[PDB]
Structures are given as structure tokens and as C-alpha cells.
RNA sequence: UUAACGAAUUUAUGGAUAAAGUUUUAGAGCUAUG
DNA sequence: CAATACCTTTTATCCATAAATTCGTT
DNA sequence: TTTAGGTATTG
RNA sequence: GUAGCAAGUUAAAAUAAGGCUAGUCCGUUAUCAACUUGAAAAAGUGGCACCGAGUCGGUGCUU
């Protein structure tokens, strides 16, 4: 006797209940608690607000760095352990000095100067090496035995910050000059080729090779310069190889098989010698030189500066930055003294000012500093070098900046190696550990391995050869690299849907291939002259046709079936094939790829081999790493020739199948003894399909399957499995939590109907006209020019693609008056450009029931073709216009018109249906078939969207929040109505499998029967034709829908949420004497070191106890709100009382402590409502019930997108504006009584009241839209800033929570209907 | 996901890296003047 | 107190799986 | 990409 | 303490407090009104009809 309608969203679930006669019911509700209100009446319509669901991405990203840091302190710890023994010979407490660099001298346990204890040599250190980058160059270059403490600093500084790993392979410091490497490339080529020598001469390899241009475009430019050799010539392939590329040297040597080489792809160190052996080892000396050039080019963009003098280019690159910075500072500091020496104190001494003082000591960024001084630079003379350096963006540069990290880790290794090479002569431990120390810089946990766990990480999957601790140097022996890489993909590979305990098989599985071919073959029927009736293929032919045609060629066409098997083997001269399409969809693609390599067809058929062949494709599909395949396949090398194995490693397969082995060949019928595959051949004269095999109550598969699946799952996992945005799953879980409570209210009765709905270019318009009159060549673009912002007006925009001519009339159109001209939909209602057309009269097409008539098509069949070839209309736009010559819009073509519109295409909503439908219908009849008690309808969102605009139920989002329940009411109404008159469409809307045909087919505008009068008659009492059931009464029902819409009480609930996440604001705050300064790590008093600030408050707790007051220390009873933070929450839950006493409370009444989560609800005094927004802040209580005539008004007053509808109704819409023009004073009057009652902000309303008095002379459409902003003052929520016209009005925040503590607390259930009220007294 | 196969984008989940920011300390501030 | 103003770490790179979505095919 | 709660200081 | 002037670019150390299961691991996603029952997961609990509508009000019947 009822129906539920839902409207699911991101931040809200909408819900309304509808009757046979479409009233929304009401009911008296009991109220718990100590308050005198023991019952309340509430309408069975509402909505549920909540904060959006948050994606794990933000969180995971924090996990990367959380690890990235606990792995970097570990990398420096590895350096120290090597030095620890040897350094103690040099400095007893060098490292201890560093560990404590952060501690203040009062807390420091050693000397204050780290590199050396003494103040005197520490000064001279910075005196000679102002940057580490300075020292790095010295540590690379000198031959002198430099102090061990310094060597550590340079090396550790490279290991602390490596640069990136986006290059594999090695680069060298020697390969910097491309010409010196280029000539070495030519120089070698002539020491090998005395018959066709080349020459360097006058080519600029440096500029040409190292350019932003394409790795191809640079190629052509170089061979163009040299005397004219071919890109295909040997030299070009060598130039091509050096530029990252994939040359084919087969052309020059004319080898039997093509061999191609890339300098990023792995197959290179191998590919050289496999090709090189045929040519000879002498040739290799060339290719290494070509590789060398490639490395010169690669780092050519990264180290742009000259670097010939030193082996340490990067540090040299810094030292120039520091020296340039120093030079230009003096010149700047000078030139300001010279001409403008009044501003200089602001510039170099004021930290706040984004000056150089702000740039260094203040927090000003390089972009902020640059912007700040660019004006001052151009007021003083000599500022050219300075300014050309500022547009270059290289002026007074810091050394460590955002743009580093374009640096690849290799060039650091080049300096580390150089230092290590220098000083190993002086320090023995260095020579031994040089390999061991470089690996620290070089190592990187390979991603497929993952976090190195000991079963104690949810994320980790790796496998260990020995249970011992992992260092970068023993990684290979302890970590089972491969099996991790298999576990790596396997944990993300889908499971078998039918049997979800077993892993899915590889897509190219040989077993899967057969399964896939025999399943298409079992349903093949052949008709021949001899036979009376068509018959399925039998067991021999399936087993014969596969052996005969599928093993012979890759794809099997139907013509091959009759000629190659039917005629040749069965000697049937003519036959007809019923089941299959033209070619067999399935293929034995793995069979043949395998066949060619091993060349042993006998090997492929012995079922003794299936496990051996399956494993190769499992290992062949799974693994990325060429090294790894070999370790796995070696087990098979005895069976196979040594040449065979070489090809197998090459073949890679990508992709995962649909079904497990256990499903196809494992599961067996207890009675038949046969498997699914074995039933797929030889099923008897009745040959059954795969789906058919599972769905036979006689066989054990329906009994075996269901045993595995029930073994079901809880809702969270049922919900979490759903694919799509994690925030919209919150609305889904909540929307199903909503439905479950509604049934409880209706006396645990199930409802018959359920309607669900979920809701979901400025310059583009200029270019489809720009180029469409360039191919037209017409001057209508020049005759009238326009701007890019105008084209969101429909009628203006249609003119331009049309060229000013009517498709229905063929005449030139006036530019000024388009209001009289109609926008015409090609198909009677689509509002897109694909189906919209602009003509003076929409009747010129002919019958408005019909497609534009043959009379206009004969006039304009050519003109719309000019517009297609100029892309001024789309083929769909054209094909719908032209369709009048293919018999017009066919009944089945018109069926495609409406049917496509009605059904929800979105896969997520469908699942929502199963969730509800399978959660509603539990009973099963005596037959296996399901009992369809509740009908789950999924409604499109546009259908209701037009319904509001059509039928005077206009929606305005921001005045109020009721429109969410309104959207649900309107979904329950339009849905139950559409299924009441159309059970044939039950299958199309409802999740039910029932059955619907397309054949039936007069108007393709589905939304018509509601209409009392329709633009060209319908009775006001509607009934289904066949059953006689009365479905819609236009006179009786439409009043109740406006009556329901215009209701002043709806349940609006904000889901209460404990707050989770980060402890506090992330910033480090400088030292302070505040007691709100949170310690960063225990030993650091934030007053001395600085700490955190601004904790997030998880939830507030209510405390009634005594505290000490005054020097008197008299205990007096206080009742207040304590804010439990996230950091605090752990301690609090263990012992609330002890935790409380530490906060200062005494004599705490434990029983009465109430944990108040965010958004908690309090009613105080005259029924104004306050939401607890924090321990110390509050949020707005109630939503303002502006009467419906205004909502309908303000939507029409706002004059939404001008007017879309028909112009004759639009005049009435315009008339409505003026007739109710005095409402603007009534609207503002509505707010004031609502403001005074609930909102308690007089301060603001008065400037508001004063603002509205001022703009009475401004037009209504301008005035009405600005009035809308004002409601954000009344909106339930958080105070926020709004502006009227030109006046910004600040927010009024409620910085005290006193008033709440003596009020009544409202605990509300998910719908809002069940309550428990608690009056608060001490 | 279509029939059925492929391709691509986007979103979801995960791994391995990088460069900045922020905070305390170390980089003897001097010269007139109480 | 309650106004009033101010504050809130960011930006890159590579690899993988899966759905959903909108293109293609012989 | 802006929300809306901490935080400190004023008239 | 004020006025003059020199100066600045670099570094170490922390990067959610921290936890035990001490791993080159883990620590910001999801989930949550209330009350009874539960270690949790989870289960349990709230008569109806009519006239009406500024945020639910009244009446009749049962209770």
C-alpha cells in the first residue's frame, strides 16, 4: 500500500513515499528521553545530508613519503656504519655532533660546531667552501688527501638527495661534448670503411643534435647537412641510434631477419652480439661509440653549461649560480645605493616585504621576489644584464630549488665515483667499500617487490629466500625477486566470477582457447538435403572440425567449414549453417604461435603436456623481465632444443581471462563423471551451451556453484566491490540504510514500488564556425563579426553553422530578431546541437507529428550536404534531417528515438538495483523461480528535470535544501506513473529478468500523458487500456503534488561524523610561548624549537565535574565541552577518567559523560537549532520554508538561460514576473522574521536591509538573482561570505558553545523520524 | 566491457622514486653612541 | 568577552591491475 | 581547488 | 636601546605524536544517532485513522 522514491547523490540521499493516489503520508512518532515531548508528528519525506566520501589517494601519497623518509635515514645510517669504525680514529664524536645539530645549545650534549668542534676551523670551512656544492667540486678535482669529515659530507650529501631514476643505463662525465663524441663516431667509421669514407668538416653537430626538435627531426637535419647520405644509409641508422630511436640495420647487411635496436629497451646488450657475430667482432668498436654519443645527447639538455674544465659538472653548475648571484647582488645593492638609496632598507632588511631580505630570510618565493623587484629594476640605469637575466628567470638564483630533480641520479654518481677514486689512495677502507658505497646511491627497491615485510604489512607481498634482514648489497640473495613479481600481478588479477575462490586463467591460455572454440561450436546446427530437421554438430565432428580446420589455420571462415570439412570429409555437396555467423569468432591463436616455435605438432597434442604448456603461457603472460623468464623456463630446457628456447622467451602475452581452470576442467558432475569441457564436446544430439551447463537442476553444477558463493558477504564488502567513485558509495550505503529503516516504519511491510535516481566549450563554438566558412568561402563571417563569449545563446549559435539560411525555407535571415524564429529539434522531443535547428516557423517542416517533410527536403537536400562537408552539422544531425527519404522516422526507428532516452545506461546504478532488488525479494516459490515482490525502477535524471520546468514545479538550489526530498518525491511520482500505464516497459526500467519486445510502436515523446493539454488533447482521468486500472487523474492528483512540494516540514538530517585524519595543521610553527603549540617530538619544548598548531577535534565530550579556581584553590562545579583531538583520542579511550584528571578536571561524574560528535544537534529556546561544529564553534540550525510561489517565481525571476521553451508560454512566464513584482519585498521580509527567530545575526542583516533599500531601481532580473545570494545567510550549514551587487557581507561565526549545554540534545535516526531527546541540567 | 576481439581515455586500488616547503641549530656581524 | 582578521605544504616521475566509457575493427 | 574551523589581538 | 655600514645563495636534523609485531614494517581511506544485548561482526526496540499546515497541531478509536 506504499512506494518509496530515492534520489542518490554525492553529499545527499533524497527520499519520499507515495500512495496509490500519490499523497505523501504522515505519522505520529514516539520520542524517548527525559523531555516532556513524548510524541511528534512528521511527514514521510525527507533527505539525509553528509560530508562527501574521501578517496584514499591523498592518504596513500602520505604513505609514500612516510616510507621515503624512513628509507632515507636508513641510507645515511649505512654510510655511517662504514665510517663509524674508521672515523673514530679521526673524530670521537663527529657523528654525535651531527645527530644533535637541531638541539639548542642548552640542550646540546656536545660542542656547538659540527664539522669540527672548534669555532675557529668551522668558520674557515664556510670561508673556503660556502656551498656543499663548492666542496663537491674540490673533492672531485684535487689530488690532495682531504679531511675524512669533509669526504663524508660530500658523499652523504649525494646519497641524501640522489636525483631521479627515470633513466636506466649509465651516463659518463667524459661524454659531455657531442662533437668530440660525434667526430669519434665518424673517426671510427673511416677506420672501418676505407672505400666510403665520410667527412666532418663544417657540420655543427652540437647545435643540430641537441635540440628540442623531434628525435626524428634532428635526424633529418644532420644527414641533410653532410654530403648527402640517405637516412637509410648506414650512417643515418647510427645517427638514428644515438638519438633515441629504433633503426633497422637489416637494409645495409640484407640479413635474413630484421633486427632492430633501441637504446632504452632492454634487448640491447644481447641484440648487439646476436647481430654482431654475423658481421664480426671488429664492428662492435663502432656501436659503443654510437652509444657513447647517445649518452652525450641525453645529458646534453640536463647540464646545459660548459663543463670541459672538470669532472664535476653539476657542482660546477652550482658554483656558477652562486658566483653569478654574488656578482649581481653587489651590482644591485650598488645601483640602488646609487640612484634610489631611500628604498634600500625595505629591500634588504625587511623580512616581510618580499625583498631580498624577504627572499632569503623571509618566506618569499623566487617567483614572488622576481615579481616584486621587476618594477624597480626598470627604473634604474644599466639594468639590462640584470633584466635579460630576469626574463631568462636566472637572477640571484638559490642553489637548491624546485627545478632540480630534472637532474638524473647518474650525474651524482659521477661525482661520488670521482671523489671515491681520488681519496682511495689515502684511505684504505674506501678502496674496499667503494663498490659497497656506490650501491647505496644506486639502489632502488624494485617496485614489483614492494615493501620488505615480515607478514606485518597489509600492502606487502614479497617472498624471502632467507629470513634475514635486507640490505641494498645482499638484496638478490635474500629476496626472491621473481615470485614476488608473480605475487605482484596475481593479487590484482580478477578472480573467477562463477567460482570466486580460484584464480582466473591467462587470457591466451591454451585451455581457455579450446574452451572458447568448443563453446561456439556446440551450438552450431547444420541442415542438409538428406536430413529431415536441423541438428547440432556431434561429438566426432567437433573433435574432427577442430583437428581438421582450427589446428590447420588461425581463423576458420564458414565457407571453409562447408568446403573443407562438410564436402571433403562427409561428401555433402550442399549444406546450410544455422548457428554460426560468417566466421568462427574463436581462434587458436596460442596454438599456432606455439606451433611455429617448437615445430612439434606431436608435442602439442599429448595431454601429458597440458600442464607443461599451460605453465609456459602463465609464465609467458605474467613476467615483464627478460632475465626472469629464463629462470622459470629452465625447468623445461631438457624437453626442448637450445634454439627453440631462444624464440619462446621473445613471445610475450598480455591479458587475463574470464574463467578458472577449476571451473572448466576441474569441476565434475558426481553422477555423469564429466567436466564442463567434456560436456562441451559429446553432449549427445542435444548439444548444450556453457551457460546452459551451469543452469541444469539435474546436473551438479548449480548445486556445486552455490556452495562456493554463499561460503554471502556483509553489505560493506557488497558495497565496496562496486566500481566507481568512493564518495558515491557513501550515498549508496546510506541510501540502502535509508530503505531498511523505512520498511521498519511501515510495520515491517515491503513496498511494491521503488524508484532510484542518481544525478551526474566556450571557445569550441568559435572554431566550428571559423573553419566552416573557410571551406564554404562565404563572406558571412566578415559581413558580421562576433566574439567568442556570445555563443551560449542557442538561436544566435544556430545561425552561424546554418550560414544565415533556413534549412526549411532557404532564405537569408535577419540578424536582430531571432526571438520570433524557433529552435526546432530535428526529432520531436534532444536539445543538443546534433538535433537542434533554427527556422522562422517550425511548421515549415510539415507535420509536427512527422519528420521534416518531403517538401523541404527536396528544396534543401543539397544545402545540408554543403554544411556536412564543412562540418557545420554532424552526420547524426544530417542523417536525421535526410531520413525523410528512407520512409521517414520508422516506428522501429522512432522506437530507437524514445527507448534510448528512457533507460539508465550507467553501470553503477544497475548494481544499486541488484543491491535493493536482491535485498527486497527473499522468498522463493516451490519452483526455483524468484518471487518479484518489490519492483526496483531506475529512473533517468533528465526526465524529472524537464518535468519541473514543464509543469510549474520549478527548482531553486540555494534558497533552501528541501529540493532533495522534492527530487525524490518527483522520482517516485514519475516512475510509478510510467510503470502503471506500461507493464511492457517493466523489463526496460525494472531490474527483472522481465521480457520486452521492440516490435510494438504513436508519438515518440514519452512524456505526454501527465499533460492536461498537449501542444499539437488528453482526458484528465487516465487508465491502463487492458486492465482498466486508473493510473493518472490530472485534476485530482496535480493539486496534491504542489500541495506536497509546498510543504513546510521535511526531515533534513546531517549525518553525524566523528572527525578523522591528520592530527593538526601540517605547518611547522616558529617557536612561541603559547600552550596551544603542539610538540613535534617529545624532547622538543615547542617554546624552544617550534611545533604544531591547530589540532583537529575528533569529537567533543561532555564533562560535569569540579575545578580549582584562584589562589584560593576552591573547588567549584563547572559543566563544559571538552574537545578530544585525534592525537588525544587514543589515550582517552583507554582511561577516560585518568585522561580527564590530567586535563585538570576533578570529581568527574563518569556516568554523565557524553561523546558529542561533529554536527551534533541541539534545540534551544524558541526552536532555533544549533549544530555542534566543534568543541568551541557552532553551526546553523534550520532551513527557511520560503513559499512555493516564490521558488517558482525566483526560478522564473532569475530568468534561467533566457527562455528555452515555446514563446507563447514564455510570455506568461514573463507576465508572471511583473504580476508578482512586489514579492521582492515579501522575500526580504521572509528572511527577517527567520533571521530574528533562529539566526541571531542582527549585525549583518542590518547592512543587508540597508543594501536592499538602495538597489530598488535596479532591474528585477538583475535584482532577483542578487537576492538569491542572501539566502546563504539563512542556509543551514556554516557561515560563509556572500555579496549583494557590489557589497561583500562577511560571515557571523558562533565562537561560544555555552548556550548548548543547557538545551535539549536531539539524537536522530538515519531518516530523521526516530528520536531521543535529552534535556541537559547539572 | 560487447556477441565477439581489439584500442584509447578517465576514474578507483597499489608499488617504487624524485625535487621544494617548513622548523632549531652551525655559518664569531662590525663601527660610532651610555 | 564578542567582533575582526588571518591562517591553512606543494609539485613532479615511472610501473602495475581493475571497471566504466567511448572509439574502432575482419 | 576553496571550506570553515584555530588562533591571536583589538577597541 | 638608536642611528650608520658589512653581510645573505650553503648545510645538518625532523617531517604526522608515535606503536610492537622491531619489519630497510606500521601510523590521515572506508565505517559510526540513541538505548537494551554483544569481545566485535552483528542482532533487538518505536499502535492506527481523520481534519488540517510556518518547520507538526488537534481529535476520535484502540492502548
Curated annotation (Swiss-Prot):
InterPro entries: Cas9, Cas9-BH, Cas9_PI, Cas9_REC, Cas9_RuvC, HNH_CAS9, HNH_nuc, RNaseH_sf. Mn(2+) 2 binds at residues 7, 964. Disruption phenotype: Loss of correct processing of pre-crRNA and tracrRNA. Loss of immunity against a plasmid with homology to CRISPR spacer sequences. Residues 1057-1322 are annotated as: PAM-interacting domain (PI). Changing residue 835 to A: Decreased DNA cleavage. Processes guide RNAs correctly. In vivo, retains Cas9-mediated CRISPR interference in plasmid transformation. Changing residue 75 to A: Moderately decreased DNA cleavage. Transmembrane segments: none annotated. Coexpression of Cas9 with an artificial single guide RNA (sgRNA) which fuses the crRNA with the tracrRNA in human cells has shown it is possible to target and modify DNA sequences of interest. Cas9 plus the 2 sgRNAs have also been expressed individually in human and mouse cells to achieve DNA targeting; cleavage efficiencies of the artificial sgRNA were lower that those for systems with the 2 sgRNAs expressed separately. Microinjection of Cas9-encoding mRNA and a synthetic sgRNA into zebrafish embryos induces targeted mutations. Its EC number is 3.1.-.-. It is an enzyme of class 3 (hydrolase). Residues 53-70 are annotated as: ARM. Mn(2+) 3 binds at residues 1255, 1286. Gene3D superfamilies: 1.10.30.50, Ribonuclease H-like superfamily/Ribonuclease H. One of its GO terms (molecular function) is DNA endonuclease activity. A motif (PAM substrate-binding) lies at residues 1291-1293. Monomer. Binds crRNA and tracrRNA. CRISPR (clustered regularly interspaced short palindromic repeat) is an adaptive immune system that provides protection against mobile genetic elements (viruses, transposable elements and conjugative plasmids). CRISPR clusters contain spacers, sequences complementary to antecedent mobile elements, and target invading nucleic acids. CRISPR clusters are transcribed and processed into CRISPR RNA (crRNA). In type II CRISPR systems correct processing of pre-crRNA requires a trans-encoded small RNA (tracrRNA), endogenous ribonuclease 3 (rnc) and this protein. This is CRISPR-associated endonuclease Cas9/Csn1. The lineage of its organism: Bacteria, Bacillati, Bacillota, Bacilli, Lactobacillales.
